[PDB]
Design a protein around this ligand. Structure first.
Ligand SMILES: Nc1ncnc2c1ncn2[C@@H]1O[C@H](COP(=O)(O)CP(=O)(O)OP(=O)(O)O)[C@@H](O)[C@H]1O
Ligand SMILES: CC(C)C(=O)C(=O)O
Length: 585
């Protein structure tokens, strides 16, 4: 009949298409490589049929064979042009079908000959989809071939729009081939990029705090033993000190060290540093003098807010400002002119030097603002609540204590030394004062479940594996995961039942968790892998450690996004909650 060139790389040589064409007495030449005009495979060729051909025909060839190049593309063109059509058909959630079209001067854009719809079952695998489509289009070709040879089909131009994909676009999804349709789309919801319409955070913390002061100025803000400050009182005193600081040269991104024991002066100092424009570097005064001397040096802190008691532990490291000297406070009680942006430093905390020397973790305002903006509505915090300043102010767990509740109008209650380790005593305080919400490390939180409590409405815990769930009170328990580098915490779970492994929940606001293999490629739901963090949580990095910063804050090779690699193992559950599975090594 005629000699037909059959171009293809992925399909076999005994296709139902080739056999059918052969059955009509056509000599079918099978070529699976790029060719040129001189190729002996283009000799006496009546028709060219391409089917999953991974190369481009030269324009010289397309011109000579105009109207005689027929392509089998398993998609509903213009949807899913290019490579991996069936896969992106499912992922991008586009219309589905198979198209037999003419080949023109571009990628899968030529006019259509025949096209029909196709359906994939929710429980079909992507491989099943790939095969169901290849079989459908092969049958369509056999059915409509005669109509195409006699050129009685009027080719119609493709609808406007569609999508296009390239060979490498599927690299990130290389492990999803044996996944189910609905199992794949589930993974899409959990890990797909942010939706449209989002705007960057436009507020700093002290900006929002000054707002909260105007709303609840006379409400109690912080308590320590018998003494207390209201939102206005606290705000005015912090301004007085902030004015003095900014007058001593404090500028945005400057680090100011604070060295105090838990007290009202600590809260004033922290805010005062913020309002002045700097970022506070907390230094526990009980730390060994070695750590203190090193923290003060590695940090660029030119100023140190401290007592006269702990003044000598600096060994003259920097300019001292006595929080108890009236000369350290200005007359001006008014808020200062704003000079910060959400991407300015807000605080710098050092991780315990378990491995190697301690590193200074930088955190920006937008990092802290996002956490508090999520914390308030998630736990329904109102000015009626009262929370504990439990954790050492050198740990990011203290940021949860102080900063979240202050923006909700609640009241902070400083936890002194005598009721830090003695949790039974701390329990009585909570019932006395009516403490309603606080965060307790996994350890202390587990012991506190023994005590009888009627005050707490909610308690949050995290930092280690939360094995024990039984507790006497009536309050909700929450498990939270995260590290200092991504601001306090990134996921939250409400503990409703007991669990063998207790999940760490779903991501907070404007954060995304990805479970990746050793090649940084997505892992299907239920498969373990290194947990990666993306979004508003990621801080600036490690202070004066750019090489180490780049090691942990990566630019992904495929999606090009900035992610923090935790070094933790985890796996998604079918209901969206995350399961922690210990460290990597
Ligand atoms: N709810 C949780 N369950 C289990 N592991 C958790 C967890 N929350 C956090 N983790 C893990 O345990 C660590 C606790 O946080 P960080 O104290 O900031 C790290 P570190 O200071 O290097 O060591 P450390 O955990 O020995 O204190 C996190 O880095 C994380 O890997
Ligand atoms: C201190 C709190 C926020 C914590 O879970 C952590 O840092 O791991």
């Amino acid at each position: 009949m005629g000699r037909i060139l059959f171009l293809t790389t992925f399909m076999s040589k005994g296709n139902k298409v080739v056999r059918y064409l052969e059955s009509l007495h056509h000599e079918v030449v099978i070529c699976q490589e790029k060719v040129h005009a001189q190729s002996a495979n283009l000799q006496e060729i009546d028709w060219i049929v391409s089917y999953a051909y991974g190369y481009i025909l030269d324009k010289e060839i397309v011109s000579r064979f105009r109207g005689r190049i027929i392509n089998l593309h398993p998609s509903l063109l213009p949807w899913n042009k290019g490579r991996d059509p069936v896969f992106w058909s499912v992922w991008d959630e586009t219309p589905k079908g198979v198209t037999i079209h003419l080949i023109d001067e571009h990628v899968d854009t030529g006019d259509i000959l025949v096209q029909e719809e196709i359906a994939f079952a929710d429980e079909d695998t992507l491989l099943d989809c790939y095969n169901k489509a290849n079989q459908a289009i092969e049958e369509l070709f056999i059915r409509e071939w005669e109509n195409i040879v006699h050129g009685r089909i009027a080719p119609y131009r493709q609808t406007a729009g569609g999508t296009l994909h390239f060979k490498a676009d599927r690299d990130f999804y290389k492990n999803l081939n044996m996944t189910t349709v609905r199992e794949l789309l589930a993974l899409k919801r959990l890990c797909a990029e942010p939706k449209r319409g989002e705007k960057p955070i436009d507020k700093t913390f002290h900006q929002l705090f000054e707002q909260q002061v105007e709303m609840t100025p006379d409400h109690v803000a912080v308590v320590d033993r018998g003494q207390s400050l209201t939102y206005k009182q606290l705000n005015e005193r912090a301004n007085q000190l902030a004015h003095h600081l900014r007058g001593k040269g404090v500028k945005p991104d400057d680090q100011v060290a604070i060295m105090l024991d838990k007290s009202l002066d600590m809260i004033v100092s922290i805010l005062a540093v913020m309002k002045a424009g700097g970022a506070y570097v907390p230094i526990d005064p009980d730390y060994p003098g070695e750590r203190i001397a090193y923290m003060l040096a590695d940090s660029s802190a030119a100023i140190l807010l401290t007592n006269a008691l702990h003044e000598e532990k600096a060994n003259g490291a920097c300019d001292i400002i006595d929080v108890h000297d009236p000369d350290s406070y200005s007359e001006n009680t008014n808020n200062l002119p704003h000079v910060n942006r959400p991407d300015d430093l807000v605080y710098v905390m050092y991780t315990s030097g378990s491995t190697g020397l301690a590193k200074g973790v930088m955190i920006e305002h937008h990092n802290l603002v996002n956490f508090c903006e999520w914390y308030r509505p998630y736990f329904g915090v109102t000015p009626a609540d009262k929370a504990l300043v439990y954790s050492s102010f050198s740990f990011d767990g203290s940021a949860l204590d102080i900063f979240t509740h202050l923006l909700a109008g609640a009241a902070l209650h400083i936890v002194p030394s005598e009721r830090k380790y003695d949790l039974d005593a701390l329990n009585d305080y909570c019932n006395q004062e009516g403490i309603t919400i606080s965060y307790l490390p996994t350890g202390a939180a587990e012991q506190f479940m023994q005590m009888d409590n009627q005050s707490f409405r909610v308690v949050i815990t995290g930092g280690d594996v939360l094995k024990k769930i039984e507790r006497n009170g009536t309050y909700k328990l929450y498990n939270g995961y995260g590290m200092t580098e991504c601001t306090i915490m990134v996921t939250m779970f409400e503990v409703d039942k007991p669990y063998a492994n207790i999940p760490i929940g779903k991501p907070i606001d404007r954060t995304r968790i990805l479970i990746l293999d050793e090649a940084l490629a997505l892992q299907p739901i239920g498969v373990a892998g290194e947990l990666f963090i993306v979004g508003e949580g990621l801080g600036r990095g490690y202070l004066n450690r750019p090489e180490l910063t780049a090691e942990k804050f990566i630019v992904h090779p495929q999606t090009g996004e900035r992610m923090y690699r935790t070094g933790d193992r985890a796996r998604f559950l079918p209901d969206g909650n995350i399961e922690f599975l210990g460290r990597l090594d």
